[PDB]
């Protein structure tokens, strides 16, 4: 069986090599480079007692949520800085938090292997319990369906009303660290601790493509604005861009001065800028097409744990282990 | 504006929870299933001299633990339990201790090392490591147990000087003084943190 798998992998690699006629860098050589991006810190949200582990922008582009080490889930108003909500968690080992597109629900989870779903109308409304590993990520499809990933090397699609796993996704050989939903909400991508990423069909429940370009564990995954590509950040101090149609890696964003992993990635509204948070306490803004570092976001006293870009693209929120959330424009 | 009133109420509650959070010391319990960790996620809350200790034993995940260990960066101490009776798995415990000690995200955390089941070791000695033959007991209180302790202390003192410390203890299955020992080593850890702050280290 090993020989057949090796032969199939060699055939896939040969097909990919034949497909690759030009390179993204060569194509994007006659376009004007993006000027020096100098984004300033417009807001600083304080109130978390310990490290901030995750955040998620609301679809209204004004309210956001954040999860902290002290077992707190705080919903902030980004404009006025005022705190909208503060939810205490039963377990203080949260790893992820999500905002519903409708804005009525907020999900979280962590080392308890549970996805807790809270109704903002604030008490818990649902507890999804089918995973045998820590819950690493969760994204809402609507008020009734949610996609989660866990450290037991599987992903799941849950019907919130019944609290049961509608679908399961298997194939990753390492703990799944991140997932990203396509704009059409018909496909999603997942990165795990096996240096591989996978594209899953939500309706069918089967893996479509597997992308293996990274050298170490993939901690962050983000989806291109038009849904035909995605970017991944890993522990080998590099970010990579993959195209679904070409089924291969396009560009690599790295410099021979970064020896720390990437904890978060995000795209701007047009997709021209790629923002990545690092363990060296700073964030880097790259030109996606030209693979050049367009700028740096500095001002966090600890490693940047979470990073998000607003739905209208008017702000970037970064949360770090320094217990602060900073909004940049 | 009612939004400012709600924010102020939330901030007052957050201050109360800040007091509660800072008034508690959290510990991470590590060790193999061979060792007697339980006898020493499961949560154990105890009190010593009106001081609250919360110890967490994480045993609900797989054996790949390089990702969820980072959740315990700001833990007060790591209680590492080792079965000194079993020589077969002693090197596994040594490798586990070395990996815990040299981790990038656990390089500022002190380890209370418990050498459990010292009665079984004493029985087994009375009627794996070739360096034991060329070993002499130190000028400490009252050979095999001190050999194992020195094996752990060599790893402890090889790296991480001044940032974190190891506190070895000899333990039995019917020892009732482990909480006091944990309290004392936690006191020393707090003292070391204060000294490192006062000198801007």
């Amino acid at each position: 069986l090993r020989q057949e798998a090796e032969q199939l992998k060699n055939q896939i690699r040969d097909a990919r090599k034949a497909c690759a006629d030009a390179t993204l860098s060569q194509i994007t050589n006659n376009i004007d480079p993006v000027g020096r991006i100098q984004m300033r810190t417009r807001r600083t949200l304080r109130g978390h007692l310990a490290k901030i582990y995750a955040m998620h922008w609301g679809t209204d582009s004004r309210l956001l949520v954040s999860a902290s080490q002290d077992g707190k889930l705080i919903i902030w108003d980004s404009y006025t800085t005022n705190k909208v909500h503060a939810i205490p968690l039963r377990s203080s080992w949260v790893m992820t938090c999500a905002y519903a597109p409708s804005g009525n629900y907020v999900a979280c989870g962590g080392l308890d292997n549970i996805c807790s779903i809270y109704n903002l109308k604030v008490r818990v409304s649902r507890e999804l319990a089918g995973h045998t590993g820590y819950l690493s990520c969760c994204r809402f499809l609507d008020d009734n369906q949610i996609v989660t990933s866990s450290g037991d090397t599987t992903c799941a699609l849950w019907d919130i009303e019944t609290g049961q796993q509608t679908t399961t996704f298997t194939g990753h050989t390492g703990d799944v660290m991140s997932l990203s939903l396509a704009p059409d909400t018909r496909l999603f991508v997942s990165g795990a601790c096996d240096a591989s990423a996978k594209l899953w069909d939500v309706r069918e429940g089967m893996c479509r493509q597997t992308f293996t370009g990274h050298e170490s564990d993939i901690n962050a995954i983000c989806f291109f604005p038009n849904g035909n590509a995605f970017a991944t950040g890993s522990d080998d101090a590099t970010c990579r861009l993959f195209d679904l149609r070409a089924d291969q890696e396009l560009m690599t964003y790295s410099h021979d001065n970064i020896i720390c992993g990437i904890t978060s990635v995000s795209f701007s509204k047009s997709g021209r800028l790629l923002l990545a948070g690092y363990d060296d306490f700073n964030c880097n803004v790259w030109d996606a097409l030209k693979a050049d570092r367009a700028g740096v976001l500095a001002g966090h006293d600890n490693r940047v744990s979470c990073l998000g870009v607003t739905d209208d693209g008017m702000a970037v929120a970064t949360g770090s282990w320094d217990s602060f959330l900073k909004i940049w424009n | 504006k009612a939004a400012v009133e709600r924010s102020k109420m939330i901030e007052k509650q957050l201050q109360k929870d800040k007091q509660v959070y800072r008034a508690t010391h959290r510990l991470l319990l590590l060790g193999a299933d061979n060792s007697g960790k339980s006898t020493i996620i499961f949560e154990t809350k105890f009190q010593v001299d009106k001081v609250n200790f919360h110890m967490f034993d994480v045993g609900g995940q797989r054996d790949e633990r390089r990702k969820w260990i980072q959740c315990f960066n700001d833990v007060t101490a790591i209680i590492f339990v080792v079965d000194s009776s079993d020589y077969n798995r002693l090197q596994e415990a040594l490798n586990d201790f070395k990996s815990i000690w040299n981790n990038r995200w656990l390089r500022t955390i002190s380890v209370i090392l418990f050498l459990n089941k010292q009665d079984l070791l004493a029985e087994k000695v009375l009627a794996y490591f070739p360096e034991f033959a060329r070993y002499t007991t130190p000028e400490d209180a009252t050979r095999a147990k001190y050999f194992i302790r020195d094996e752990f202390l060599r790893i402890s003192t090889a790296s991480g000087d001044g940032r974190h410390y190891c506190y070895p203890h000899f333990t039995c299955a019917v020892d009732t003084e482990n909480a006091r020992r944990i309290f004392n080593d936690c006191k020393d850890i707090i003292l070391q943190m204060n000294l490192r702050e006062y000198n801007l280290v």
Partner: nanobody
Amino acid sequence: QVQLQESGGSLRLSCAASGFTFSNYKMNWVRQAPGKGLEWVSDISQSGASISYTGSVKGRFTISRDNAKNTLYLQMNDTAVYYCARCPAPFTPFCFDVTSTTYAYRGQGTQVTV
């Protein structure tokens, strides 16, 4: 695609590595004995620096790495399946989950019978 291929089964076990920068990681030699679990044999850093061995084979086995050739050698002079394992991340002096039941950055192994 990270690939580790083991060859050899006195012996001169070799491990050819591909899909990653070999001269950036700390390599390990591990075994699985019949009816037992995965046991760590030896460990070598990324620059020929400090080398560790297990007690059972201390002084009898040796480990080397050819960064230019991107190979890991183990010279031996018990019956088990030997694997060459990689540290999860570069520039870190600690291999954490190398002796795990399902490790992603470990080779297929070669059988050795004595």
